[PDB]
């Protein structure tokens, strides 16, 4: 089942900087849309976290949501010399990158959209650290991290990495290890709140608290395939908003149905709610939580 795999509530814009080859088909994201930065997110056997949390937000959709700023530069070149921002955070990665790709975006420590791009027409290697000569080449980027976002606004400038007993993980300089460093590639989650740093975690505990929220409804155009339509354009009952909206009994019981005056159809959906995160015991609202495979240096003794 799962009729809400490709439908993106709210914004739904997967525009990448530098790799400008999919601006025609990428905004918005409909059911019959084409975009290499979203098709691999629902691939069987790749990112199960996005398949489980499909009715949420992504990285670029969070950048275009006026809540996450972009890095400078947003698209770094792989053929530079010294002083490359996308070098230390990229070489310590571990997830294998597929073929027929040139750009690769991820999340930096400061919490901005960081991406890399090679000169045309050079594709990525096996690890994605370097580049090499060139199915068909994709017109977009490849998400290097399996993270998601939502509509949150809590501050997290006072919360730091809570990884106890860890010397240096990823690119952050936590504490000073007294024993011998044990280089091992493991999976360590991360969490980024509203304008904060990359706060790593150890035991991710995510819960869902669904309630009467406007994000639990979708709307698709009629057909005498499917299209895209924003559900936030439907006002309450006994009122008039910007665009017309209509639906069935569940959608008409809370919102005003305009019958044939609209161009869509509201249906009873779900999978939204308010997802919380377990950070330092106190349940907070995540904004950029996910998983990143970096190099973990633990103590041998």
């Amino acid at each position: 089942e799962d009729p809400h795999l490709r439908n993106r509530p709210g914004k739904g814009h997967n525009y990448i900087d530098g790799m400008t080859q999919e601006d025609a088909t990428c905004k918005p994201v409909t059911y019959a849309g084409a975009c290499s930065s979203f098709d691999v997110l629902l691939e069987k056997g790749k990112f199960p976290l996005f398949q489980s949390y499909a009715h949420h937000r992504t990285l670029l959709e969070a950048v275009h949501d006026t809540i996450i700023a972009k890095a400078d530069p947003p698209s770094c070149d792989l053929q530079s010399a010294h002083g490359n921002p996308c070098m230390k955070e990229k070489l310590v990665m571990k997830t294998h990158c597929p073929n027929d790709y040139q750009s690769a975006h991820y999340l930096n420590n400061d919490g901005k959209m960081a991406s890399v791009k090679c000169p045309p027409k050079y594709e990525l290697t096996e690890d994605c650290n370097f580049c090499r000569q060139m199915a068909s080449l994709k017109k977009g980027s490849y998400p290097l991290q399996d993270l998601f976002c939502q509509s949150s606004e809590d501050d997290g400038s006072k919360l730091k990495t809570k990884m106890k007993g860890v010397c240096e993980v990823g690119v952050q300089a936590l504490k000073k290890c007294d024993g011998q460093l044990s280089t091992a590639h493991e999976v360590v989650p991360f969490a980024v709140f509203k304008n904060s740093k990359k706060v790593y975690l150890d035991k991710l505990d995510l819960k869902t608290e669904e309630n009467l929220l406007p994000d639990s409804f979708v709307c698709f155009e009629h057909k005498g395939e499917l299209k895209s339509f924003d559900i936030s354009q439907c006002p309450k009952i006994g009122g008039h908003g910007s665009k017309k909206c209509t639906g069935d009994a569940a959608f008409c019981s809370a919102y005003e149905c305009t019958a044939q005056y609209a161009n869509a159809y509201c249906s009873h959906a779900n999978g939204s709610g308010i997802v919380q995160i377990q950070v330092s015991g106190v349940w907070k609202k995540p904004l950029c939580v996910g998983y990143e495979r970096v190099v973990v240096k633990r103590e041998l003794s």
């Binding site: 106890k164 007993g165 000073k176 330092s280 103590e299």
Partner: protein
């Protein structure tokens, strides 16, 4: 009330200090041992760094001695009410055969009841034959048939969960306080482990239990009090027994889901040619719930319910003798040397001596800045820690002594310089 009754020093093998940003911090990569406190008493953990003033403490507040129960085979139950539906048809008309209704299956929807609707409840289909002729409105000489379609629905707005207890686990609700001041309330039973921010903890020694718990069934009520029944656990649900219709969840009883269990050939019927009254003699659990409502008097113990966490308990009247294992999952403990002043004064000293209870001390700490106060004696067996802030507040904790005439000199400080202090108070003999 604060006050570590048993205090122990951590070993130097698992205590390695460091220095980062004009601060001396150290982590713990081991596990210490401390005696479990009684009702009111605590069990602090003195941690030493590189010198004398840098001293941390981890207080564990003990609520009371409880004996939780271990749930095993659980099931939900409740009251129900059938609804008999009659539909008589003539013989040799569709499926009006006298031989088909005899071996009619319950999970087979007849042609005369295929228009009921979405009925996902405990439904069944029978087949009782009647008479024929022109006396009951029948065209054929052969006797007619009466189709039966009875489904079970829920009529009670609440339900009850009947379960048992295979063993009484001695659970101890501990309020572990971290070094910085983070308060965390957890629980430990027998040899169970939890997950805290400083690592993990588990109960060690346990010499308290109640035998003979399999022959007692418990009943849980949503929000209301619990119950106890003096009978063994319900085996197979049969006719004329408490718990003949069970399920698996609360929604399976509040909505009468078909995924539950029931007694076969339990729904009675009244074949009255055209009339039918389906009535069942279900056992009402509310009578037993009212006759046996907690709390009750059972032997020399007090059986009651529990607050916050759902579960059965058992109040005891014995001593508290247990051990705790504070497992540190390599967690760093930092400390900043304060520089604020604090002129404390003695108030009173009430309590008892030579017992696990202790003695309450009264101290009027008057400081000008937000920090922490550390106190100690002379030989090195007593330590008092109390918060300090700008103003005049009355603090204190529970202290243990073995003499009614307490004349021990204390050494408290708040920035570096230590000043003498003498305490006094008359205590009573408390076992």
């Amino acid at each position: 009330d604060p006050g570590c009754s048993e205090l122990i020093q951590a070993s130097s093998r698992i205590t390695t200090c460091s220095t980062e940003g004009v601060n001396t911090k150290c982590r713990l990569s081991g596990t210490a041992l401390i005696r479990a406190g009684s009702v009111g008493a605590e069990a602090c953990l003195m941690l030493k760094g590189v010198k004398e003033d840098q001293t941390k403490f981890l207080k564990i507040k003990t609520v009371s001695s409880e004996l939780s129960c271990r749930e095993g085979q659980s099931y939900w139950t409740g009251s129900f009410s059938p609804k008999c539906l009659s539909s008589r048809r003539c013989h040799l008309v569709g499926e009006c055969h006298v031989n088909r209704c005899l071996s009619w299956r319950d999970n087979e929807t007849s042609a005369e009841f295929s228009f009921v609707g979405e009925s996902t409840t405990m439904r069944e289909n029978k087949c009782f034959e009647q008479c024929g002729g022109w006396g009951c409105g029948c065209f054929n000489v052969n006797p007619s048939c009466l189709f039966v379609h009875t489904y079970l629905q829920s009529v009670r707005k609440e339900a009850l969960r009947v379960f048992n207890c295979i063993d009484w686990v001695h659970k101890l609700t501990l309020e572990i306080t971290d070094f910085d001041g983070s308060v965390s309330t957890i629980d430990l039973g027998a040899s169970s482990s939890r997950f805290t921010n400083w690592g993990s903890v588990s109960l060690s020694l346990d010499a308290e239990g109640i035998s003979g718990s399999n022959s007692f069934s418990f009943i849980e009520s949503p929000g209301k009090g619990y119950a106890i029944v003096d009978e063994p656990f319900s085996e197979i649900p049969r006719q004329g027994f408490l718990g003949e219709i069970r399920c698996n969840s609360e929604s399976s009883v509040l909505s009468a889901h078909e995924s539950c269990l029931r007694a076969p050939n339990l729904i009675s019927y009244k074949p009255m040619i055209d009339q039918l009254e389906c009535t069942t003699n279900l056992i009402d659990p509310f009578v037993v719930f009212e006759r046996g409502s907690l709390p009750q008097t059972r032997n020399d113990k007090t059986f009651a319910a529990s607050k916050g966490n759902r579960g059965v308990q058992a109040f005891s009247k014995g001593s508290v003798q247990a051990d705790l294992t504070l497992m540190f999952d390599n967690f760093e403990v930092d400390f900043v040397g304060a520089a604020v002043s604090c002129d404390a004064a003695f108030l009173n000293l009430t309590g008892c001596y030579s017992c696990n209870a202790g003695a309450r001390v009264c101290l009027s700490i008057t400081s000008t800045g937000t920090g922490s106060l550390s106190a100690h004696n002379k030989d090195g067996s007593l330590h008092i820690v109390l918060p300090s802030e700008n103003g005049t507040k009355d603090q204190c904790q529970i202290l243990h002594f073995t003499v009614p005439e307490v004349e021990e000199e204390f050494m408290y400080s708040c920035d570096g310089d230590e000043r003498p202090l003498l305490v006094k108070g008359t205590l009573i003999a408390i076992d």
